[PDB]
Structures are given as structure tokens and as C-alpha cells.
Design an enzyme around this catalytic site. Structure first.
Site, PDB file in Angstrom:
ATOM      1  N   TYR A 473       0.910  -1.153  -0.137  1.00  0.00           N
ATOM      2  CA  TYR A 473       0.219  -0.346   0.008  1.00  0.00           C
ATOM      3  C   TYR A 473       0.967   1.308   0.078  1.00  0.00           C
ATOM      4  O   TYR A 473       1.126   2.106  -0.963  1.00  0.00           O
ATOM      5  CB  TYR A 473      -1.050  -0.079   1.169  1.00  0.00           C
ATOM      6  CG  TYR A 473      -1.887   1.037   1.249  1.00  0.00           C
ATOM      7  CD1 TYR A 473      -3.251   1.134   0.321  1.00  0.00           C
ATOM      8  CD2 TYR A 473      -1.821   2.118   2.128  1.00  0.00           C
ATOM      9  CE1 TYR A 473      -4.212   2.147   0.359  1.00  0.00           C
ATOM     10  CE2 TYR A 473      -2.754   3.087   2.191  1.00  0.00           C
ATOM     11  CZ  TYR A 473      -3.711   3.358   1.408  1.00  0.00           C
ATOM     12  OH  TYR A 473      -4.763   4.155   1.323  1.00  0.00           O
ATOM     13  N   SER A 554      -6.365   1.278  -4.427  1.00  0.00           N
ATOM     14  CA  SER A 554      -6.316   2.567  -4.088  1.00  0.00           C
ATOM     15  C   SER A 554      -4.957   3.410  -4.238  1.00  0.00           C
ATOM     16  O   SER A 554      -4.632   3.335  -5.181  1.00  0.00           O
ATOM     17  CB  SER A 554      -6.806   2.492  -2.441  1.00  0.00           C
ATOM     18  OG  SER A 554      -7.503   4.016  -2.500  1.00  0.00           O
ATOM     19  N   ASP A 641     -17.786   3.721  -7.595  1.00  0.00           N
ATOM     20  CA  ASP A 641     -16.402   4.269  -6.543  1.00  0.00           C
ATOM     21  C   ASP A 641     -16.388   5.735  -6.686  1.00  0.00           C
ATOM     22  O   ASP A 641     -15.580   6.262  -7.427  1.00  0.00           O
ATOM     23  CB  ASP A 641     -15.160   3.588  -7.251  1.00  0.00           C
ATOM     24  CG  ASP A 641     -14.004   3.672  -6.228  1.00  0.00           C
ATOM     25  OD1 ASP A 641     -14.335   4.653  -5.317  1.00  0.00           O
ATOM     26  OD2 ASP A 641     -13.121   3.224  -6.363  1.00  0.00           O
ATOM     27  N   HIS A 680     -15.827   1.621  -3.997  1.00  0.00           N
ATOM     28  CA  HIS A 680     -14.217   1.302  -3.524  1.00  0.00           C
ATOM     29  C   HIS A 680     -13.885   0.129  -3.031  1.00  0.00           C
ATOM     30  O   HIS A 680     -12.756  -0.319  -3.026  1.00  0.00           O
ATOM     31  CB  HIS A 680     -13.894   2.653  -2.775  1.00  0.00           C
ATOM     32  CG  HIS A 680     -12.399   3.120  -2.845  1.00  0.00           C
ATOM     33  ND1 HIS A 680     -11.701   3.090  -3.929  1.00  0.00           N
ATOM     34  CD2 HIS A 680     -11.527   3.035  -1.684  1.00  0.00           C
ATOM     35  CE1 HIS A 680     -10.464   3.467  -3.672  1.00  0.00           C
ATOM     36  NE2 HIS A 680     -10.336   3.437  -2.278  1.00  0.00           N
TER      37      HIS A 680
END
Length: 710
Positions: A473, A554, A641, A680
Site C-alpha cells: 500500500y 487505492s 467508486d 471502492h
């Protein structure tokens, strides 16, 4: 392999913008309009080639069948007590949405309290936030449809689970907090806006306000308690102190882990809550984070990062509030991050630390901050906790890579504290003992040592022969800690794979310094760290480039897309979920303005110069070497999203297919799948989760020609 043609996609070669003298062409800017016939046809055409590719090979069905079997296990949350009753969430195994149960005692028979599955057949209406009244007799809950961040708040009387008429609209990014008199509840809402508010719009969200809803009235009657007309990005979240005396307002502007802290002593209101409250601006800047833990009269305990990047506990006395007077209750640790703190049984604090990316849990005395008890845990994460100031017990849930985990209970009224297993489920089909988890630290480009977890079958030979799935991430102070994924374990067991998770900079694993090491001018450190994780797995023989898949979602989608552009030679397959791809325009849409703390904003010449170097949309380039092509890529997004508007993935895939997909040397596919009635990710129904993981691993298997291992 490639027996399909990429869609025709018009290039608007007139679309040019100047950024501080730097001209940028944006030929797919028209994909920014979700409502146009052109964009709708684009999405249709892309899905028309992606779906047959994913479904064609028998391995998708093999994976899906196994996921359906193995994911079908009972899934419980911690019990929590509210008033005289206990609650917990539970999914029998394959329900689209977990269900909220109630019992009148721990011994007692449970009954359904709130079942979201009956609200939509495809399970696309989900709970998003809830709050009980202080006495536990009333209940407010948010519902989101189709995965949108927008919320409708509804209400129930707990006894008899009775629906009430109250409904609050225009709620997004909202706290919910009842006053202790039981009269009503604070919440946030946005002003009316033109166009849609269903998750398919891209409109920026500004001027959030704080309202108070009196139970039994229309939303039109709600009291405006705080607003920031000169600061359209500020968001003020309200909570009540444990004694009900004070409203604490935490004001945030974007993603920076800092907040203003104002308070309202409710005893001092001229006539109850009737308009803007008499806010006392205790902390009136954005220099530090202050998270309320508890108070004893005017002495307030906060978790803070003020000159303490690994966080600490301080007491601020509202009668003597100057900084030089604050008391340090639990000093900052040299290395371990204090993740969260709860107060329970009046005068106990529960502290959860992160020690080299694993959780520890301990009990401290409120008055002195002294350590009282360590709660023993295996290596993994604490993912659930209950126990508030008036409670006399705690529950907490532990999880790890290899087992769904354990819910513990501890009765805090006993002289000798004895945590006990309260619930433990084992997944038949997976034998945790066949696998191992190791943690290593590898050097990045600049020599910084980065943690990585690797999960694999015991006794494998490190000969480079294994498929690997590397996840990252790297942003927003988020720590990526051990978690249980049946989907990833099927890759290990049934595809012979190695799992890896790299704790790259930008995350919170080593406190605020780790976060700052991967943001703004230093965002490239994230990408370098993750590329170095791939190099480690290769050099040490877990995998080879042709067998390596990277994944993130993301900000993690930005991560893997950037890595595909920067080091296409290093990866066989890339799956980027709901990724931010246009780094020049992200701040223009929905809540994207809130990410500038990590990224910067293209309106600044200095920031533009960082952003343009790594923005995925602006760095697609044919590899120079004849023997290098792009990895196979799959972008996953969805039409509601509204967290990361799908135009990011639409414009990126159009660019990939045109610049790279047209080249004769490119034989690896570059595909997007845009789902419907999803967003999302939060609240996604089980049915959709299963389809999504099946698509992902089918893509990997087909692109890397991996045989199923039954």
C-alpha cells in the site's frame, strides 16, 4: 494468446493544459464524464473483451468453487455491550452481508437485530457506521447503496427492534454521537448540490457541517452546531465525553494525522443545543493529532503525536490548558507505535502497540500510566476490541495470515485477570501447520531496512520456480499488518504460490517518520521500496520476474501501476484495484482534495515537479529494449467508486492500450473490468468478493500459465 482486439478509443489531440509552463496533453479527458454516451460505450467495449478472457479457462471455475467452499465458514465479530444487552455481528458463511444479533445476556439466546440482506437481493445495501444511545435503548445506523460513500441514517428502538420514522440524508464522512440525555444525535452532512448524489457523480465534496438531530423530528428542523464557511475543506467530527458533559469537536483538513480540538461544555449552553455552540478552542491549529481517550472532570487524556511520532498519552487539564502544563501519562516508546487506547472499567486503559508490524495488547492504570498486565498474543493483528469506560469486561479479536483467529474475553472485575478464548473457528480444507510466515528486513535503494512478511508452504526449495503474489500500500499512515485471507491461501495451496507483503514507507509501521518517508517529495521512496521487495524475492529464490504478480488497491493501485511503468522487466502480472492514476487531477473530484497531504497538489509548481515524474497516466512508455514488454495488467474498478472516481482507471487503460498495446512486441494483455452496483470496496457483498478474487487469480493463472494443484 491474444485473440481479441482492443476497442477504438478517440484521442482528443486538442486537450492540452499548461502547468507552470509545462504542457500536458490529456487525449482521454472526455472519459472524465461518467454520464456521456462515449464513456458508457467505452466501458461496455472494455468489459466485452475482459470478461471472456477471464472466464474462458477452466481454472476460474476451479478457483471459484474452491473459494466458495473454503470461504464458507462462520464469521463472528467481538461481542459488545450496550445498556443491558449484548450485540455481535455474524455471517453464517456465505451471506452477502453480516448480520447484527442481540442477546439479553451472555448466557442468553441470540436473535436477529439488523439483517441488511433483506434490503437488497444482491446484497448491495450495506451498513456504514452506527451509534447507540448512551443507555443502549436507541440505535442509529448508516446505509450505503452500491458501495457509495453516501449514507442515509436511519433509527430503531432497540427493545423490539422497532423501525422509527427518522431519516437523515446528504450524510458522508460522518461521525455519529448521541447526547447522554437521549434527546438527539450529532452527525455531519453536506449542502444540496446540483446533479446526482448516488456515487456515480465526480462532484467535489466541500462545506461539510455539524448538525444535531432531535429524535422524533424532521431533518429540516436539525440544529446547525458548527460550520467553517471560510475553510471549505474542514471537517468537524463530534463525540461526547464519557461523562456526557462535553462535546469534543475534532476538526480535520485532509489526510494529515493532525486535528484541531475544540470543546463545548454542555452545562454552559444558555438553553440547550439551539444553534452554534459556545466552542472553546483548546487546540486551534493543525500541528498535532489529539484523540480523546477519557476524562476525569476537567483532566482529559488524549493519544497524541505532538513531538512524538510513535505516539504517546498526555493529560490536558481544561482549567490549566497551556502546553508547558500538560502531563505525560504514558511516554512515547523509542520504536513501538501506540496504535490506539481505550478506557475500560473506570480506571483501566487498554493500549495496543505495533512492534515490528505485529500487535501487542496491555492494560495500564489510568491514574499513573503504569503497566499492569500483558495480554499474551501469537504473531498477528488485533482487529476488533470492545470495552468502554462503564464496561467491566473486554473482548478482542486476533487474526493472522494462517488462521481466521480467535475472539478473547476478559472479565475485569476479577482479582486475577484471566483472558479466555470466547470464540474460535478453524477452516477445514486449510491446515495452518503446512505453512509458515517469516519476517525479513531488506535494504531499499537508500539503505533503509524495510520489513516484509513472506508466507509459503514449509520446505520449499528457494530455486526461483514459484509463482509469487507481492502486496503493498505505502501511504496515509496505514500499517499493513497480518490478516486472514482464504483467497490468498488458495493461491498458496492450489497454485503453488508464495505470498509477500512489503511494509514500505508512506505507511504507519514505524510511526510518523515512516509516513513522512513516503510522501510529498519523498513519494518515490515508496516505489523504490516496493521494487526492492520484488528484487529481494527474486534474488533470494522465492520467485522470478516472469512468475511474479504485484497487487495493491487505492493508493496501492497507484503503487503497482507506477511500478509497472518504472520497472516493467521486474513483473509478470500487475493487478491494480481502484487506483489513483491521474496525479495531476485527483484533487478535483469527490474527496480527492483530502489526499494532498501525501501527494501534494498540481497547482503548486514544486509539487507538479514531483507528481509528473511518477503519475501513472503520464508515464506510460514503450520499454526501450526489444526483449522487454509491459507485464500483463488488469485494472479493477466500479461505477459507484466515489472514493477514487473510475475515470482514473478509464484514462489509464486507454493510454496503456494505445501506447503499449499497439506495439508488435506486446503480447501480454492490458485489461480493465468495471463492475456495476459496487464502489471502492467497503461493504461489498460476499457474492461480489468471490467473483473478484476469482477474476484476479484466473488472470494470474492464464497469463503465467499456472496449472491448478487440486
Amino acid at each position: 494468446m491474444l485473440s481479441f482486439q482492443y476497442p477504438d478509443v478517440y484521442r482528443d489531440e486538442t486537450a492540452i493544459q499548461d502547468y507552470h509552463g509545462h504542457k500536458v496533453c490529456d487525449p482521454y479527458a472526455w472519459l472524465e464524464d461518467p454520464d456521456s454516451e462515449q464513456t458508457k460505450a467505452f466501458v461496455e467495449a472494455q468489459n466485452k473483451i475482459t470478461v471472456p478472457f477471464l472466464e474462458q479457462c477452466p481454472i476460474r471455475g476451479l478457483y471459484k468453487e474452491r473459494m466458495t467452499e473454503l470461504y464458507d465458514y462462520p464469521k463472528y465479530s467481538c461481542h459488545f455491550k450496550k445498556g443491558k444487552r449484548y450485540f455481535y455481528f455474524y455471517n453464517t458463511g456465505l451471506q452477502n452481508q453480516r448480520v447484527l444479533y442481540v442477546q439479553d445476556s451472555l448466557e442468553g439466546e441470540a436473535r436477529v437485530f439488523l439483517d441488511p440482506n433483506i434490503l437488497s437481493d444482491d446484497g448491495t445495501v450495506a451498513l456504514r457506521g452506527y451509534a447507540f444511545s448512551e443507555d443502549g435503548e436507541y440505535f442509529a445506523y448508516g446505509l450505503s447503496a452500491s458501495g457509495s460513500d453516501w449514507v442515509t441514517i436511519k433509527f430503531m428502538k432497540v427493545d423490539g427492534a422497532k423501525e422509527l420514522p427518522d431519516v437523515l440524508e446528504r450524510v458522508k464522512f460522518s461521525c455519529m454521537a448521541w447526547t447522554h440525555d437521549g434527546k438527539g444525535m450529532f452527525y455531519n452532512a453536506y449542502p444540496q448540490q446540483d446533479g446526482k448524489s448516488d456515487g456515480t457523480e465526480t462532484s467535489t465534496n466541500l462545506h461539510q457541517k455539524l448538525y444535531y438531530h432531535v429524535l422524533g423530528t424532521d431533518q429540516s428542523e436539525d440544529i446547525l452546531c458548527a460550520e467553517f464557511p471560510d475553510e471549505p475543506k474542514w471537517m468537524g467530527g463530534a463525540e461526547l465525553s464519557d461523562d456526557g458533559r462535553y462535546v469534543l469537536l475534532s476538526i480535520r483538513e485532509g489526510c494529515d494525522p493532525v486535528n484541531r480540538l475544540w470543546y463545548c461544555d454542555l452545562q454552559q449552553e444558555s438553553n440547550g443545543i439551539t444553534g452554534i455552540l459556545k466552542w472553546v478552542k483548546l487546540i486551534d491549529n493543525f500541528e498535532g493529532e489529539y484523540d480523546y481517550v477519557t476524562n476525569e472532570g476537567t483532566v482529559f487524556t488524549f493519544k497524541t503525536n505532538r513531538h512524538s511520532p510513535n505516539y504517546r498519552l498526555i493529560n490536558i487539564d481544561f482549567t490549566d490548558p497551556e502546553e508547558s502544563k500538560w502531563k505525560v501519562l504514558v511516554p512515547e516508546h523509542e520504536k513501538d507505535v501506540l496504535e490506539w487506547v481505550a478506557c475500560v472499567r473506570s480506571n483501566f486503559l487498554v493500549l495496543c502497540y505495533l512492534h515490528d508490524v505485529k500487535n501487542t495488547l496491555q492494560l495500564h492504570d489510568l491514574a499513573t500510566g503504569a503497566l499492569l498486565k500483558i495480554f499474551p498474543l501469537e504473531v498477528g493483528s488485533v482487529v476488533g476490541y470492545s470495552g468502554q469506560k462503564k464496561d467491566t469486561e473486554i473482548f478482542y479479536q486476533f487474526t493472522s495470515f494462517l488462521s481466521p483467529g480467535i475472539i478473547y474475553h476478559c472479565d475485569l472485575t476479577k482479582e486475577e485477570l484471566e483472558p479466555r478464548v470466547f470464540r474460535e473457528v478453524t477452516v477445514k480444507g486449510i491446515d495452518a501447520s503446512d505453512y509458515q510466515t517469516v519476517q525479513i528486513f531488506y535494504p531499499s535503494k537508500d539503505g533503509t531496512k524495510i520489513p516484509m512478511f513472506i508466507v509459503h508452504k514449509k520446505g520449499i526449495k528457494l530455486d526461483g520456480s514459484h509463482p509469487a503474489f507481492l502486496y503493498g500500500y505505502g501511504g496515509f499512515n496505514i500499517s499493513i499488518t497480518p490478516n486472514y485471507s482464504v483467497s490468498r491461501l488458495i493461491f498458496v495451496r492450489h497454485m503453488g504460490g508464495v505470498l509477500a507483503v512489503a511494509n514500505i514507507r508512506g505507511g504507519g509501521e514505524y510511526g510518523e517518520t515512516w509516513h513522512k518517508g513516503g510522501i510529498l517529495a519523498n513519494k518515490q521512496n515508496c516505489f523504490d521500496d516496493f521494487q526492492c521487495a520484488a528484487e529481494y524475492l527474486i534474488k533470494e529464490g522465492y520467485t522470478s520476474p516472469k512468475r511474479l504478480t504485484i497487487n495493491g488497491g487505492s493508493n496501492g493501485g497507484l503503487l503497482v501501476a507506477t511500478c509497472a511503468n518504472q520497472r516493467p522487466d521486474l513483473f509478470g502480472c500487475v493487478i491494480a484495484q481502484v487506483g489513483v492514476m491521474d496525479m495531476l487531477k485527483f484533487h478535483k473530484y469527490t474527496i480527492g482534495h483530502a489526499w494532498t497531504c501525501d501527494y501534494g497538489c498540481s497547482d503548486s509548481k514544486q509539487h507538479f515537479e514531483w507528481l509528473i515524474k511518477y503519475s501513472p497516466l503520464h508515464n506510460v512508455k514503450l520499454p526501450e529494449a526489444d526483449d522487454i514488454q509491459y507485464p500483463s495488467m488488469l485494472l479493477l474498478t466500479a461505477d459507484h467508486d466515489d472514493r477514487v472516481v473510475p475515470l482514473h482507471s478509464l484514462k489509464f487503460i486507454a493510454t496503456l492500450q494505445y501506447i503499449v498495446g499497439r506495439s508488435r512486441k506486446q503480447n501480454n494483455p492490458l485489461l480493465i473490468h468495471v463492475d456495476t452496483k459496487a464502489g471502492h470496496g467497503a461493504g461489498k457483498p460476499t457474492a461480489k468478493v468471490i467473483e473478484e478474487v476469482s477474476d484476479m487469480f484466473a488472470f494470474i493463472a492464464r497469463c503465467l500459465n499456472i496449472d491448478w494443484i487440486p
